[PDB]
Design a protein around this nucleic acid. Sequence first.
RNA 1: CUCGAUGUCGGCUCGUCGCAUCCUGGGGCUGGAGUCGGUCCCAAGGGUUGGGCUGUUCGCCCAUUAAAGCGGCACGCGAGCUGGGUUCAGAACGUCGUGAGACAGUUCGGUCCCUAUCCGCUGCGCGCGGAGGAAUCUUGAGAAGGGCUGUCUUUAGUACGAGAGGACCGAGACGGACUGACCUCUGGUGUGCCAGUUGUUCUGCCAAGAGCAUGGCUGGUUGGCUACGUCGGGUUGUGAUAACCGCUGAAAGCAUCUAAGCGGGAAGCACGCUUCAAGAUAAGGGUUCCCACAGGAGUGUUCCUGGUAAGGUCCCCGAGAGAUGAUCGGGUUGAUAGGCCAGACGUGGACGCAUCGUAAGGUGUGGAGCUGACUGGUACUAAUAGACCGAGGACUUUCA
RNA 2: GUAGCGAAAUUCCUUGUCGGGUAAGUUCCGACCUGCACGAAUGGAGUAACGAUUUCCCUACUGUCUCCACCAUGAACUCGG
RNA 3: CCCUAAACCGACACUGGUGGAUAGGUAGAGUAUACCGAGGCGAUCGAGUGAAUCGUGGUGAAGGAACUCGGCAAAAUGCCC
RNA 4: GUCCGAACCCACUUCAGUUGAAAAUGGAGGGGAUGAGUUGUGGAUAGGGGUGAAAGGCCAAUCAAACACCGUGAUAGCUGG
Lengths: 120, 214, 122, 62, 114
Amino acid sequence: PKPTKGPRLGGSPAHERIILRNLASQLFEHGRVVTTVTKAKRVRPLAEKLINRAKTDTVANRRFVNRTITDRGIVHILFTEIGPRMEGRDGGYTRVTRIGIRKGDNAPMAVIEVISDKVA
Amino acid sequence: ERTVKGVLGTKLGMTQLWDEHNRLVPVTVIQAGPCVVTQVRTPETDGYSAVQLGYGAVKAKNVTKPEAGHFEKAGVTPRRHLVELRTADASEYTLGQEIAADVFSESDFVDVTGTSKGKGTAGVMKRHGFGGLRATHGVHRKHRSPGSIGGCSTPGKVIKGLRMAGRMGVERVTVQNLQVHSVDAERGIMLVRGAVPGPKGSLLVVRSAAKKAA
Amino acid sequence: MIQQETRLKVADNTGAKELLCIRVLGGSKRRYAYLGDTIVCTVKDAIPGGNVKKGEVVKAVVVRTVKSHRRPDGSYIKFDENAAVLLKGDGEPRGTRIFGPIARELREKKFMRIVSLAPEVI
Amino acid sequence: AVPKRKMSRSNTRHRRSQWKTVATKLVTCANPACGEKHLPHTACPSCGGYGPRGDRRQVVEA
Amino acid sequence: SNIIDEIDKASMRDDIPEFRPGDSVKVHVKVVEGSRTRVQVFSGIVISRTGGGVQESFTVRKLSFGTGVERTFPLHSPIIDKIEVDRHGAVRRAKLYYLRGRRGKAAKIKERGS
RNA sequence: CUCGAUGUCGGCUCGUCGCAUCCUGGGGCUGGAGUCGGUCCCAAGGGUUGGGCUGUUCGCCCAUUAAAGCGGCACGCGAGCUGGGUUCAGAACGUCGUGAGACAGUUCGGUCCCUAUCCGCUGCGCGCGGAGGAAUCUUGAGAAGGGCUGUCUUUAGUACGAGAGGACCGAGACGGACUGACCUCUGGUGUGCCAGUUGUUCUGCCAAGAGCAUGGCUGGUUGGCUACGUCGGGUUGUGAUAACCGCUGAAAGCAUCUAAGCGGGAAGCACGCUUCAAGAUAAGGGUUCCCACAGGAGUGUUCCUGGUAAGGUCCCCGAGAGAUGAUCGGGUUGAUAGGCCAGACGUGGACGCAUCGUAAGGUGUGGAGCUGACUGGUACUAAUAGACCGAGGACUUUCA
RNA sequence: GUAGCGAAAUUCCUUGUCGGGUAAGUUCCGACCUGCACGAAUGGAGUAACGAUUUCCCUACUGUCUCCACCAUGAACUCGG
RNA sequence: CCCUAAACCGACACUGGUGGAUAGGUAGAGUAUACCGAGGCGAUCGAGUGAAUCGUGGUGAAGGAACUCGGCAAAAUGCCC
RNA sequence: GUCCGAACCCACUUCAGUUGAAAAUGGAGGGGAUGAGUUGUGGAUAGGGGUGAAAGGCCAAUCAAACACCGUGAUAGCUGG
Ligand SMILES: [Mg+2]
Ligand SMILES: [Mg+2]
Ligand SMILES: [Mg+2]
Ligand SMILES: [Mg+2]
Ligand SMILES: [Mg+2]
Ligand SMILES: [Mg+2]
Ligand SMILES: [Mg+2]
Ligand SMILES: [Mg+2]
Ligand SMILES: [Mg+2]
Ligand SMILES: [Mg+2]
Ligand SMILES: [Mg+2]
Ligand SMILES: [Mg+2]
Ligand SMILES: [Mg+2]
Ligand SMILES: [Mg+2]
Ligand SMILES: [Mg+2]
Ligand SMILES: [Mg+2]
Ligand SMILES: [Mg+2]
Ligand SMILES: [Mg+2]
Ligand SMILES: [Mg+2]
Ligand SMILES: [Mg+2]
Ligand SMILES: [Mg+2]
Ligand SMILES: [Mg+2]
Ligand SMILES: [Mg+2]
Ligand SMILES: [Mg+2]
Ligand SMILES: [Mg+2]
Ligand SMILES: [Mg+2]
Ligand SMILES: [Mg+2]
Ligand SMILES: [Mg+2]
Ligand SMILES: [Mg+2]
Ligand SMILES: [Mg+2]
Ligand SMILES: [Mg+2]
Ligand SMILES: [Mg+2]
Ligand SMILES: [Mg+2]
Ligand SMILES: [Mg+2]
Ligand SMILES: [Mg+2]
Ligand SMILES: [Mg+2]
Ligand SMILES: [Mg+2]
Ligand SMILES: [Mg+2]
Ligand SMILES: [Mg+2]
Ligand SMILES: [Mg+2]
Ligand SMILES: [Mg+2]
Ligand SMILES: [Mg+2]
Ligand SMILES: [Mg+2]
Ligand SMILES: [Mg+2]
Ligand SMILES: [Mg+2]
Ligand SMILES: [Mg+2]
Ligand SMILES: [Mg+2]
Ligand SMILES: [Mg+2]
Ligand SMILES: [Mg+2]
Ligand SMILES: [Mg+2]
Ligand SMILES: [Mg+2]
Ligand SMILES: [Mg+2]
Ligand SMILES: [Mg+2]
Ligand SMILES: [Mg+2]
Ligand SMILES: [Mg+2]
Ligand SMILES: [Mg+2]
Ligand SMILES: [Mg+2]
Ligand SMILES: [Mg+2]
Ligand SMILES: [Mg+2]
Ligand SMILES: [Mg+2]
Ligand SMILES: [Zn+2]
């Protein structure tokens, strides 16, 4: 999706690329993730694009999703559980909720989860 | 002292056309929408003559009781922007009068005023055209530096108005002697030949050219 | 754009082969010369049998810039080399043949012999 | 550079008094069965919930 | 916006042929010369197409008298009487800038559908 | 004055001031015919180039320009830079000395530290005030900027001139430098988009992909930023003047621009143009909004607390804003952002299949697939829900 | 004061003079000899090869520059320690 | 028990120094370099944020040393037959 | 006492560092790299002495005469109190 304008996560754009891929994969694996506010708000678009691709089940679509993610268990979850869950949902497959702050460094935390209830 | 026609508009972007001589002209597109006369300033009451115009759509829940009362006295629906035009013939305007983009014709020269794009805190090199030092040849951590900022004991001070780093942009800018290329009055669109200050979607005041032309 | 120390090829049969731009004429602090602009040059290369000798300070008119030239109709013209045509001090070519295509910018009421002698004017 | 003189107590306190924070504001939980303070636009620590009184959702199992 | 596009629709033409970069193209350009108006033909290979509405433009490269000349025309410019497509090249990109460093058979394009 | 250190030559950078003016502006006199000049009177608004040699300043030279001004500011400016020169230790030459060594002689090399406390300056905020509390638009005391200039055509081959040559005063066209905004065009960028590709490792393998090597490298590239780009500007003018030129006119029967009085006259002065501006505490002005609450002590009712009105702020979504504050817009009565759908830009022909080839691969299906910022829709997600501040008819006096 | 060298790591005057190189060269390269104040083992004049030595020139190449713009990063900036 | 080191010499749990041995794969001439193995690590304050500015890298139109005391720095070149 | 080039030894240029990561280093290049090479272990030379392919260089992080203690509370026509 859109680039991030300012300095990237992890001290390098390559590390942010990797961080966002891993964070989206973990969100799909667990359904929800506590990942500080900025990381959640930054991985929401990529994860939503991946879910939208997973909404339609084809081999080419699964290969394209496997470009990202790269874990076939996560691809199976995304094309078997998460993807069918949003058949009537036109966007907005995830939500982010602020949770508090971390004691050690005052980092504002958040929970990003995949929408769990069916639209119908 | 001077008689000025004027309208309020929105910067929409830039395009290009070819005129009758097949010359490419850059045009700013201005949504010079409907402006209503919301107040009339007279020498008897305010000490000067002017027309306070209103332009723009506003949500009724975003207008306050003082603003609602002002517009109710004007007899118009609330507008987002109120801008005064200093004209010697402010006496010819009535409260609630509708002023459209057709105030200007197909070859009028106009002055366009807007708030320019902002750049944040710029250095001396960007905001004032300073030359720094060389990229090499010994230069020690002072490549984009202001150089000297004064003399010595006499005076033991930096003079007022020395050009230094600071926030640049977001300021009133008037571009003079811009030729109106075209006016589409029914949809309130104005093609003005040149570039005008501000980002897209910023409020523009289009007035008669003070110096007529060059 | 042609500035001082730019070396241009010669589109004339004057015997000169390379010119070094010494000055761009047209005003104080003037930086660049474009199509149709006159420059002072020194002959860096010349044909051994020829009327123009190496190290001669001449005046040339610029044709064929590499950079680009904007035209009022919004179009641009571009060449592959920088070229110049030597002048006799009145605006008239020293040579008698013009080689390569020539910018239409030369036909701005100024350089008529160069246009007539040009094989192609673009 | 280096400070030329010892800063006076008046000036030192003038600058030092501006090193201060603000109190956290806090809002009452919309859940009737919790009624505990939490941050605005933040899930409640005491019940883990979020939303208006009508449509609550659980953000943290805590 | 769409208002910009609808304003620009009045400056567009409808006689533009279907050509890509790599195609061989004849551009008939009207030149005003003294009191006369003439049409001069610039023939060459399309090496670029910078797109978008009335800002569409294309560059044609020609090899004349032992030197390369490239001309950038706005696609909807009134100075173009017509554009003719001679060949349809077979290229693998949208910008043929590498052709600036080639000549001879290395500069000739294939023919589409060969 | 300074040796319990006031760093010094030249340059770079950034200026500011003077006028003893180099250009442009105005004038008097000429041994001023015209074109050009000389000279001295006004005049500091703007301007006042790039290189070769040398550490240089200076100077000579090259090509220009309207011109390539002279000076001050610790021979302005090293807590701004350089370190080529000079004044460290090495070394060599010439010369001087028996020698150690020496030279305002030359020659090659030779550590330039500092996180800014105060004033100063450039920007950005918080507070209080502006005699009720607010919202919105403003006046302008004052402050800042801007102010440069050439060529060509015409008047006119006219005036002048024996000819050669050749105008003033007016009109127009195009420029150089500077500068404001802008990104439609062109160019640059691109850690993001598409593609290709080398080495390797991995997803079990084929297929299809992924990590790393500067984004591995290579070819393009929307948006944003930007100049090398695009548009605009300096002004026509007004008032008082300078040098200067006068009108009338005595003292002084004449004469005299002056003593009474009146007038022409410059890029200079003040305006005209742009911008800031009521902390302008002299705290301004117009329009609109809310209004006579509650409880204590009281002592001309005072004054202090409390809940509010109009209005705001916290908080959240953002950008046309931004270091942070601030600013601007939106917060379900919603298109603010994301997602979704569609289009445009960009790339350049995805996977799979069919087919031809031994294979690398070619062809079709098919301008395919992918795809950011641009555009238009669309509440799917997040803007939940709430708090806090904020007058009291607002001190007093005299008028009307 | 011989041979040889000489405006030289030596020449003050000095940017000596003449030639070459440049559009322009106080440096350089070749000479001249007027050697302030060269000179023969404190060696003289040469010399292939060699040199992170010093000097001058040509070409290639470039953000060194005309004239800078943009990108990412470690600080700087905001928050907590 | 540490031992090309957080345990030794450096005042430090210090981007320095410290002798010897074992030292695999693919590409490669290679013990260079790239990616991996055996094995071991994620480094001893973090979280953000497109300010200027400094450091470290990258790209660049046209020109190509005009920079500068000086081509300092960079680019270009680069390997095998 | 060959050439290119790692380990290794060195330290030419530049940038950074300069209250440093470091009381001399780091990044990027650079020189030597079978030799007058480099390095471990132990040993010998001691202060008017050592040793020195020679810089007044080095002799335990300031050497035109080390460091420690003693003469000693050296002396100072000088500065300070
Ligand atoms: Mg970006
Ligand atoms: Mg960080
Ligand atoms: Mg990488
Ligand atoms: Mg520069
Ligand atoms: Mg630097
Ligand atoms: Mg100083
Ligand atoms: Mg203070
Ligand atoms: Mg296209
Ligand atoms: Mg002192
Ligand atoms: Mg004077
Ligand atoms: Mg001045
Ligand atoms: Mg000085
Ligand atoms: Mg030196
Ligand atoms: Mg010595
Ligand atoms: Mg002797
Ligand atoms: Mg004023
Ligand atoms: Mg655009
Ligand atoms: Mg481009
Ligand atoms: Mg495979
Ligand atoms: Mg490389
Ligand atoms: Mg762009
Ligand atoms: Mg008289
Ligand atoms: Mg004041
Ligand atoms: Mg001499
Ligand atoms: Mg000489
Ligand atoms: Mg000579
Ligand atoms: Mg003898
Ligand atoms: Mg001797
Ligand atoms: Mg002897
Ligand atoms: Mg020799
Ligand atoms: Mg802190
Ligand atoms: Mg260590
Ligand atoms: Mg170990
Ligand atoms: Mg230790
Ligand atoms: Mg060792
Ligand atoms: Mg190996
Ligand atoms: Mg290795
Ligand atoms: Mg292992
Ligand atoms: Mg280990
Ligand atoms: Mg660390
Ligand atoms: Mg860590
Ligand atoms: Mg530690
Ligand atoms: Mg590129
Ligand atoms: Mg370049
Ligand atoms: Mg190029
Ligand atoms: Mg070249
Ligand atoms: Mg030079
Ligand atoms: Mg040179
Ligand atoms: Mg120079
Ligand atoms: Mg170098
Ligand atoms: Mg290099
Ligand atoms: Mg050897
Ligand atoms: Mg060797
Ligand atoms: Mg040594
Ligand atoms: Mg011993
Ligand atoms: Mg010595
Ligand atoms: Mg020692
Ligand atoms: Mg001693
Ligand atoms: Mg002694
Ligand atoms: Mg005694
Ligand atoms: Zn709760």
